[PDB]
Write a protein that binds this ligand. Structure first.
Ligand SMILES: [Cl-]
Ligand code: NA
Ligand code: NA
Ligand code: NA
Lengths: 263, 272
C-alpha cells in the first residue's frame, strides 16, 4: 500500500532531518516505492520536515544543453547555432537522469533557479535565493557555485534511494582538491543576455569523467565505512544523510592523499 | 559520391512553418493533442514544439491542453474500507499549482502546465491549461460537475470559434468530443458520481463530483469512428509536422457534426 505523507515525514525525522536545515536531495522515485499522491508528496513531506525555515535544493541542469555541437560537421553545427533555443531558466527542462523529482522541484511554487545552464540548481525555502545567487558560468561546481554555499552554511546531502556515485557535491570536492592531473574543458552554450540569444563558451573542469583513478562511489563508500553520516529507510528506499562540510573535507583529503601534492 | 543523410532534428523554424501550412493563423485559439514520439527528434526538445506552435499563434492567439490530474483518487470506493480511510486522511487535495498532469495526456500537457503565464482550470479531473490572449477566459469558472459541459473550457473554445490540432495523436483522443456527448440528445448516457479532495479556503475538503462517464462511450461508437467519418466527408485539414501526421479541426464545425452524428444513430424518438 502506498506510503503516506505522515509516514514519510516520520521517516525523514528519524533519519535526522531537522527544522531549518539546508538540504540537497538526490533521489530515485522507483526506490521509494508507491507514494499516496505521487512524487509531489515526497517533496512536500521533506519540505514539512525542514519547515519554511529550511531549504531544499536539487541539481537540475539542462536536459537539452547543446554542449556537444563543436564536434559536429560544420553544416549541422551551423543549424544548431541558428536554431537551437537558448537556456531560459523559466522553461529549460531538468536533466532526466537527475530524477523526475528535480523537474518536479524546478516547477514548484516559490522556486529559485541558479543561472549556470549545465550546473543549474533549483531550491525552495528560506535560503533558496542565497544558495542560487550569482552562480558563475565558468567552473560551475567551484567557488561561485550553490555547492560552495551549501558547504559554507553547513548544509546536508540526502541520498533517497540514489546511488552514492551521484553525489554532485563531490564535483566541488574535485574542484577544491590539489591534484596531480586535471582535465579542463571549454564548450559552447546559448544563453539569454538582455533578452537575446547569445552563444558563449563555458570553461569548467570535466565532470563527465574523473580526473584520475577514482569514482565517487569509492569516496562515498569509504566515508560511510569510517562512520560518516546516518543511514535509514524512507519508504522502500535506503537513505543516507551527510553533512556537506564534513563530507567535502573528507573527500578533498581522500583525493589529495591519493593524487595530491607530495611536496 | 552516394547520397548521405545528415539526420538533423526538426528545427523551430521548420515546425513553425509546418504548423502554418496546416492552417494555424495568428490570433486563433487552439487545443492541442500530441505524441512527442510521433513528431520525432526536435532540436531543443518538446519545449520547441510548444514554442513553435505559440509562435505560429502569436501572443494574440491561445494554446490549451487537457491536463487533468495524474493522482486523482477517484477510485477509493473500490478499496477495502480501512484503506479508503487512509486515503481520506492522507491523500493530498487537488492543488492547481502542483497537481501533475495525467501522463497519458502527453508529457507536453505537463510541459504546458508549467509554462510561464499559464492559466489552469479548477475542475481536477477535467483540468485544462492554457497560455495566451484568451487563456484566462478559456479556463475561468470551470464547474466541478459536468466538466465537459456548458461550464467548461470546451464550451468556451467552441464559443470563440477555436480549433483542435491532432499532432501525431490518435483521433480517439479528441477531448472535445466529450463536449459533443454532453450536448447530444442520446437515448441513455451514463452518469458517474465520485469523491475528490479539493482545496477550499486553503484546507482539504472531500467533495462528490457528478459527470457523464468519459472512460467509456454511452453507446456503440468510438471517437475514432466519429472523427474518421468527419475527415471522410471533407472535415478539417491535414499535413505533416515533423514526422507526425497532423489534423486541424474547427471546434464549432466538429462539435456540430459530432452532435448530429450521435443523435442520428443513438437518439431517442420516444415522446415522453
Ligand atoms: Cl487541510
Ligand atoms: Na511546511
Ligand atoms: Na563551516
Ligand atoms: Na553549523
Amino acid at each position: 500500500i502506498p506510503h503516506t505523507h505522515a509516514h514519510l515525514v516520520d521517516a525523514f525525522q528519524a533519519l535526522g532531518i531537522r527544522a531549518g536545515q539546508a538540504l540537497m536531495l538526490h533521489a530515485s522515485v522507483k526506490a521509494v516505492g508507491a507514494v499516496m499522491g505521487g512524487p509531489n508528496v515526497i517533496l512536500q513531506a521533506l519540505m514539512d520536515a525542514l519547515t519554511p525555515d529550511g531549504t531544499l535544493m536539487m541539481y537540475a541542469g539542462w536536459q537539452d544543453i547543446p554542449d556537444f555541437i563543436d564536434s559536429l560537421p560544420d553544416a549541422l553545427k551551423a543549424v544548431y547555432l541558428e536554431q537551437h533555443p537558448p537556456f531560459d531558466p523559466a522553461t529549460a527542462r531538468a536533466v532526466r537522469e537527475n530524477s523526475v523529482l528535480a523537474e518536479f522541484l524546478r516547477t514548484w511554487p516559490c522556486v529559485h533557479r541558479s543561472a549556470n545552464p549545465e550546473a543549474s540548481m533549483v531550491a525552495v525555502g528560506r535560503q533558496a535565493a542565497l544558495l542560487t545567487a550569482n552562480h558563475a558560468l565558468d567552473y560551475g561546481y567551484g567557488v561561485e557555485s550553490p555547492l560552495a554555499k551549501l558547504v559554507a552554511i553547513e548544509g546536508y546531502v540526502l541520498m533517497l534511494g540514489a546511488p552514492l556515485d551521484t553525489i554532485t557535491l563531490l564535483h566541488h570536492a574535485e574542484y577544491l582538491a590539489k591534484m596531480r592531473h586535471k582535465n579542463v574543458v571549454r564548450y559552447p552554450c546559448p544563453i539569454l543576455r538582455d533578452g537575446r540569444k547569445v552563444w558563449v563558451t563555458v570553461e569548467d573542469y570535466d565532470t563527465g569523467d574523473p580526473h584520475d583513478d577514482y569514482s565517487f562511489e569509492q569516496i562515498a563508500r569509504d566515508y560511510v565505512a569510517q562512520g560518516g553520516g546516518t543511514r535509514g529507510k524512507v519508504g522502500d528506499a535506503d537513505a543516507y544523510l551527510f553533512a556537506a562540510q564534513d563530507l567535502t573535507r573528507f573527500a578533498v583529503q581522500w583525493l589529495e592523499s591519493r593524487f595530491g601534492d607530495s611536496a
